Design a binder for this molecule. Structure first.
Ligand SMILES: Cc1cc(C)nc(SCC(=O)Nc2cccc(COc3ccc(NC(=O)c4cnn(C)c4)c(Cl)c3)c2)n1
Ligand SMILES: [Zn+2]
Length: 298
């Protein structure tokens, strides 16, 4: 397959991004792009997750059937985990620069914290693969009244189980609970976007949650894939790889031709890439302006 990168380094990726061959970038992002914003990863053991509620199994608090009959536990956790402020990271604003420079095809996020929207990505730019707290809906099939985060926040902090003003049904945040399908939008956008992608930028995800992780296998064979992450991720598991074989990351073998791993904090990796691209002053000015604005509204 074609080698579009002149070397398997951040420097090689930057030169490719500055070439006429790189027009359409897809970002895949996870909890690792929001930890520097003080949003802990609810999957991280060190900020791991309630015994009084008698959960049949730990993951029942995020299962749709359990939630609809016993929603109190989930809403108690929602108050406990509610961020003190919503200040997007250097990584979020790097994706805003991709948008500004006409390079952003799509940002696929596993995060529910709304920081991509606050950083200035529009709904059209975004696939919230695991849903979002940004909007909530009445669960009654005939109603489905939509409620904004401002409304849901008041209910969470008041410790009042949120009920629909029209029909008094439960109102659920638009997150994908276990037992719910990923949004139709995820599959529809994936089918179109991965025909068009020139660069896959994977940031702040261990690529362990499916089917989101399998997106890396949907990239054309020639498409360079840059991982910015604290740990190497996306390589075929030596044990699972025996079952399902094709598309796994290859950073370090003699056959490696398009995959690059930059190991460190997402903010530092995005700053390093911005610096190579001549965007460092633009990124600094954007971040300090937006942070100042958020600080003054907080
Ligand atoms: C705007 C806002 C509001 C709030 C309250 N927090 C935040 S960020 C802090 C935080 O982590 N809050 C939080 C609080 C309660 C529960 C949860 C749990 O969130 C989830 C999201 C998606 C999912 N869905 C999936 O992974 C999923 C499903 N199927 N597949 C295949 C994957 C789950 Cl299981 C849980 C998070 N941001
Ligand atoms: Zn309703």
């Amino acid at each position: 397959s074609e080698r579009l990168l002149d070397e398997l380094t951040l420097e090689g990726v930057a030169r490719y991004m500055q070439s006429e061959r790189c027009r359409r970038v897809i970002c895949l992002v996870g909890a690792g792009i929001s930890t520097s914003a003080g949003i802990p990863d609810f999957r991280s053991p060190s900020t791991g997750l309630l015994e009084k509620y008698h959960l049949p199994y730990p993951e029942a608090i995020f299962e749709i059937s359990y939630f609809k009959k016993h929603p109190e536990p989930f809403f108690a956790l929602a108050k406990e985990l509610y961020p003190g402020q919503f200040k997007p990271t250097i990584c979020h604003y790097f994706m805003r620069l991709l948008k500004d420079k006409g390079l952003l095809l799509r940002c696929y996020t596993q995060n529910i914290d709304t920081l991509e929207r606050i950083a200035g990505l529009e709904q059209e730019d975004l696939v919230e693969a695991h849903g979002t707290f940004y909007t909530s809906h009445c669960v009654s099939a005939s109603c489905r009244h939509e409620y904004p985060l401002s409304w849901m926040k008041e209910k969470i902090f008041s410790e009042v189980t949120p009920k629909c003003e029209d029909c008094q049904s439960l109102v659920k945040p638009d997150i994908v609970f276990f037992g719910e399908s990923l949004p139709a939008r995820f599959f529809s956008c994936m089918q179109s976007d991965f025909l068009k992608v020139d660069l896959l930028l994977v940031m702040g995800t261990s690529l362990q949650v499916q089917p989101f992780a399998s997106l890396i296998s949907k990239a054309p064979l020639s498409t360079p894939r840059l991982l910015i992450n604290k740990e190497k991720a996306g390589q075929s598991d030596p044990f699972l790889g025996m079952i399902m074989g094709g598309g796994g990351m290859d950073f370090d073998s003699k056959k490696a031709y398009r995959d690059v791993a930059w190991l460190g904090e997402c903010d530092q990796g995005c700053l390093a890439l911005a610096e190579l691209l001549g965007w460092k002053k633009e990124l600094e000015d954007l971040v300090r302006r937006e942070h100042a604005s958020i600080d003054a509204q907080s």
